[PDB]
Amino acid sequence: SVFLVVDEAKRKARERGVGLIDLSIGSTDLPPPEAPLKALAEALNDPTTYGYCLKSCTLPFLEEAARWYEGRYGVGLDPRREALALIGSQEGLAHLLLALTEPEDLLLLPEVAYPSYFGAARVASLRTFLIPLREDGLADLKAVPEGVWREAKVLLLNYPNNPTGAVADWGYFEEALGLARKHGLWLIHDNPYVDQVYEGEAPSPLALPGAKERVVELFSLSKSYNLAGFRLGFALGSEEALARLERVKGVIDFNQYAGVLRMGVEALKTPKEVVRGYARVYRERALGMAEALKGVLSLLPPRATMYLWGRLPEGVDDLEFGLRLVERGVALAPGRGFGPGGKGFVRIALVRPLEELLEAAKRIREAL
Amino acid sequence: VPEPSVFLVVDEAKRKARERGVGLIDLSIGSTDLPPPEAPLKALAEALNDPTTYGYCLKSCTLPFLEEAARWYEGRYGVGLDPRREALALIGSQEGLAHLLLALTEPEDLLLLPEVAYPSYFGAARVASLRTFLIPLREDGLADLKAVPEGVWREAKVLLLNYPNNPTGAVADWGYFEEALGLARKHGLWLIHDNPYVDQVYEGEAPSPLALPGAKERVVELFSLSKSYNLAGFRLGFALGSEEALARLERVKGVIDFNQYAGVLRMGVEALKTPKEVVRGYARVYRERALGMAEALKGVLSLLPPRATMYLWGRLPEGVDDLEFGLRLVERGVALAPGRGFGPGGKGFVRIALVRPLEELLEAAKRIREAL
């Protein structure tokens, strides 16, 4: 890694007593609603939950998930065919890649993406083509040559995005689905930050006409409800794709603890006002700190997620700078670690009170 | 990989007897009827009140558990393991096996495992795009390491074993493992030993190939809290051994998961501290069930002397097919697992899961006798 370094070089600066504001890890400071915790607790009192929670055991959760999805996109899904419980979405992603491919098949993904995407790709022994990004932060789907589309077997995307925090419009997704249909590709959309848009709703490529033919969308309880440690997510979409995922996860796991599935059910019933609150916090943080960084970092307008993506001044190297910045009291994630397209950017995780972020922005300014 | 029809046919049949409301004694699934100790549950419950547990439980967060794990192992085999280098938390062992295979191999590498094994082993091998060589069993139920031809040894990359064994219920001794480790070393292979039923031997203690000289170089052993503590649903286990191997496994799990919930790891630390009297008590229950039912099956099924696990592995009378008998038996009120479901060497065999009280197992034995 590169985060290995910075991680060390931070645990070092800490030892040495340097007061360091850590904004390099997207681990929220916000609490989860209580109801799901109470449900998990009550579950511990029921001994029927001590054995493996098999498929049928996950229905109630998948049913609620189906209702959740339909409740915001108007498209119905059959819980027993187009939904699968995930022990966290990262798990579904990696396993979905194994399920839908064969060694040496070609995968298409952005040149800037969640680090483990490239990893999951190597785990499935897949060749990859990295899609350059548009100036607005989305992968330039038109930058893919005809030959690559013909070779491709899977297209992976994620918006709202990590690390860019970029938002995609329905139009972007229509383009992606269209190309996917046109070239006979599976389209995996990882959507963990669905509930973290600042203004409006997050489009869903699974909500488009005919999506159920090649689209699987990954959702998680981690970001939406701050229950990341409980490891629960859900895959919705193409029954064909899901059946293959289910087969793979079948020889690998037995799902999460029944108690957590029940917590999953309560989680989905969390008042929308609460889920919206979390997003409002990030909106306030993103905007406050962005104004304090103007002239320092070249930031795209903040619209979603816990991340700020900023381009360093000409010349400046993100790894060196990150390190130099650590010694100064602020930990950042070098863009570099999100892919080659990241070289020259830093990612800031708005996981601390506005005050701290304003202070952290003060230092970053000094550091340049 | 076994034909999924084998268990589809049985499930379907059980599904029906249920609807038609028939008295059915289900001994086809190895999930215990025994409760877990209370302490682990309380530990987990208590962690729910701790806000700091709500986030990801990364490597550091798993230390206490691995530390206790290393201690648990040292306390058994008088061999020390560095918790920070030779142990890795697992979200249940199943998960560990599959990902370990991936970490230690490349598509088309050759894997050696018994012609009779836990179904997911073959499946895991497929997920890894691995070729396989199924080792035939000896009369005592252990894989016949002497039947592996030199040429097969030369191209192999991994050897997979499981003792106490599912579905045979066979136990290996130190000699067998010393033999296995020698071959693996001589042919430069990794040696993976899945040991979910370690605490289920009826008399004494189960060996550990990791406990032998030179093991730390090529052995990874997998343990789980599922069978020993009846906590299958909480998904927690641990890998021990080769630092080189585990670093590979750690790298794979790193791009796939974030370990289990911190609260469960604390549940783990507590589970390992369970008085050994309780754990042996569990094995005691299976021993009583295994010997009683086996007495009742004498003449009907030719059983290997029961020595460990919640499993009984009987050979059907010459001429009767296991899947056919299996379906026929469900209609009579007893569900078994057709040997064929565990691989080719399972033809003509049936596995019985001792997961119901002895009186029920006795009734079941009576029906198995009448159906034959």
Do the strands B337-338 and B311-315 form a parallel or antiparallel pair, or are they unpaired?
A: unpaired
Which residues of chain B make contact with A49, given a CB cutoff of 8 A? 233
> Do the beta carbons of residue B169 and residue B311 sit within 8 Å?
yes
Tokens, residue B324: 């056919």
CATH number at residue B21: 3.90.1150.10
Q: Quick one: B195 and B344 in the same domain?
A: no
Instruction: Determine the 3-state secondary structure of B276 from DSSP.
Output: helix
Can you tell me the distance from the alpha carbon of B158 to that of A235, in angstroms, rounded to the nearest whole number? Answer: 33
Q: Quick one: B264 and B289 in the same domain?
A: no
Can you tell me the distance from the alpha carbon of A233 to that of A218, in angstroms, rounded to the nearest whole number? Answer: 8
Can you tell me the distance from the alpha carbon of B343 to that of B3, in angstroms, rounded to the nearest whole number? Answer: 9
Peptide bond into A132 cis (omega under 30): no
Q: Quick one: A263 and A313 in the same domain?
A: no
Can you tell me the distance from the alpha carbon of B60 to that of A230, in angstroms, rounded to the nearest whole number? Answer: 17
Amino acid at B256: I
Which residue of A231, A245, A247, A249 to mutate against B (max B Cβ within 10 Å)? A231
Q: Quick one: A309 and A254 in the same domain?
A: no
Q: In degrees rounded to 5, what are phi and psi of residue B116? A: -135, 120
Decide if A77 touches B, using CB distance below 8 A: no
Which residues of chain A make contact with B229, given a CB cutoff of 8 A? none
Chain A, window 201-220: residues with a beta carbon less than 8 angstroms from a chain B beta carbon? none
The CA distances from residue B322 to A6, A190, B9, B328, in Å, are 60, 45, 12, 10
Decide if B129 touches A, using CB distance below 8 A: yes
Show which of A240, A269, A298 is a domain's final residue: A269
Q: Quick one: B175 and B214 in the same domain?
A: yes
Q: Quick one: B89 and B76 in the same domain?
A: yes
Residues with Cβ within 8 Å of residue B336, at least 6 apart in sequence: B27, B28, B326, B329, B350, B351, B352, B368
Chain B, window 1-60: residues with a beta carbon less than 8 angstroms from a chain A beta carbon? 31-32, 35-36, 41, 44-45, 48, 51, 53-57
Q: Quick one: B354 and B282 in the same domain?
A: yes
Q: DSSP alpha helices (H): ranges in chain A? A: 3-15, 34-44, 55-73, 89-99, 115-123, 146-151, 170-183, 221-225, 239-250, 258-268, 272-291, 318-327, 354-366
CB contact under 8 A, A252 and B36: no
| Resolution attained, angstroms | 2.3
CA A140 to chain centre: 19
Can you tell me the distance from the alpha carbon of B294 to that of B309, in angstroms, rounded to the nearest whole number? Answer: 13
> Do the beta carbons of residue B240 and residue B223 sit within 8 Å?
yes
Break chain B down into helix, strand, coil percent, rounded to 5: 50, 15, 35
Q: Quick one: B329 and B254 in the same domain?
A: no
Report which of B124, B28, B61, B19 is spatially closest to residue B268, judged by C-alpha positions.
B61
> Do the beta carbons of residue A288 and residue A358 sit within 8 Å?
yes
Shortest CA gap A244–chain B (Å): 11
Beta bridge partner(s), residue A133: A139
Q: Which range of residues forms the domain containing residue A302? A: 1-50+270-368
Instruction: Determine the 3-state secondary structure of B291 from DSSP.
Output: helix
Do the strands B156-161 and B131-135 form a parallel or antiparallel pair, or are they unpaired?
A: unpaired
Q: Quick one: A76 and A192 in the same domain?
A: yes
Can you tell me the distance from the alpha carbon of B144 to that of B160, in angstroms, rounded to the nearest whole number? Answer: 13
Report which of B81, B110, B24 is spatially closest to residue B243, judged by C-alpha positions.
B81
What's the first-to-final CA gap in chain B, in angstroms? 29
What's the first-to-final CA gap in chain A, in angstroms? 25
Which candidate from B32, B45, B56 shows the least CB-CB separation from A44? B45
**Residue A340 carries which DSSP code?**
G
Decide if B247 touches A, using CB distance below 8 A: no
User: Residue holding tokens 């943080």?
Assistant: A285
Show which of A243, A269, A295 is a domain's final residue: A269
Which residues of chain A make contact with B236, given a CB cutoff of 8 A? none
CB contact under 8 A, B257 and A123: no
Shortest CA gap A39–chain B (Å): 11
Show which of A269, A304, A329 is a domain's final residue: A269
Chain B, window 56-75: residues with a beta carbon less than 8 angstroms from a chain A beta carbon? 56-57
CATH number at residue A193: 3.40.640.10
> Do the beta carbons of residue B269 and residue B338 sit within 8 Å?
no
CB contact under 8 A, A27 and B56: yes
Q: DSSP alpha helices (H): ranges in B298-343? A: 322-331
> Do the beta carbons of residue B313 and residue B351 sit within 8 Å?
yes
**Residue B233 carries which DSSP code?**
G
Q: Quick one: A155 and A187 in the same domain?
A: yes
Can you tell me the distance from the alpha carbon of A362 to that of A329, in angstroms, rounded to the nearest whole number? Answer: 11
* Structure-determination technique: X-ray
How does DSSP assign A256-289, residue by residue? S-HHHHHHHHHHHTS-HHHHHHHHHHHHHHHHHH
How many domains does chain B divide into?
2
Q: Quick one: B226 and B161 in the same domain?
A: yes
User: Looking at chain A, how many residues does it have?
Assistant: 368
Tokens, residue A277: 């609150």
Break chain A down into helix, strand, coil percent, rounded to 5: 45, 15, 35
Tokens, residue A365: 């300014």
Can you tell me the distance from the alpha carbon of B311 to that of B116, in angstroms, rounded to the nearest whole number? Answer: 14
Chain B, window 184-203: residues with a beta carbon less than 8 angstroms from a chain A beta carbon? none
Which candidate from A50, A88, A103 shows the least CB-CB separation from B107? A103
Can you tell me the distance from the alpha carbon of B228 to that of B224, in angstroms, rounded to the nearest whole number? Answer: 7
Report which of B210, B145, B216, B138 is spatially closest to residue B179, judged by C-alpha positions.
B145
Shortest CA gap A94–chain B (Å): 6
Residues with Cβ within 8 Å of residue A259, at least 6 apart in sequence: A39, A40, A43, A44, A49, B233
Decide if A94 touches B, using CB distance below 8 A: yes
Q: Quick one: B125 and B257 in the same domain?
A: yes
Q: DSSP alpha helices (H): ranges in chain B? A: 5-19, 38-47, 59-77, 93-104, 119-127, 150-155, 174-186, 225-229, 243-256, 262-272, 276-297, 322-331, 358-370
Q: In degrees rounded to 5, what are phi and psi of residue B222? A: -115, 130
Shortest CA gap A278–chain B (Å): 16
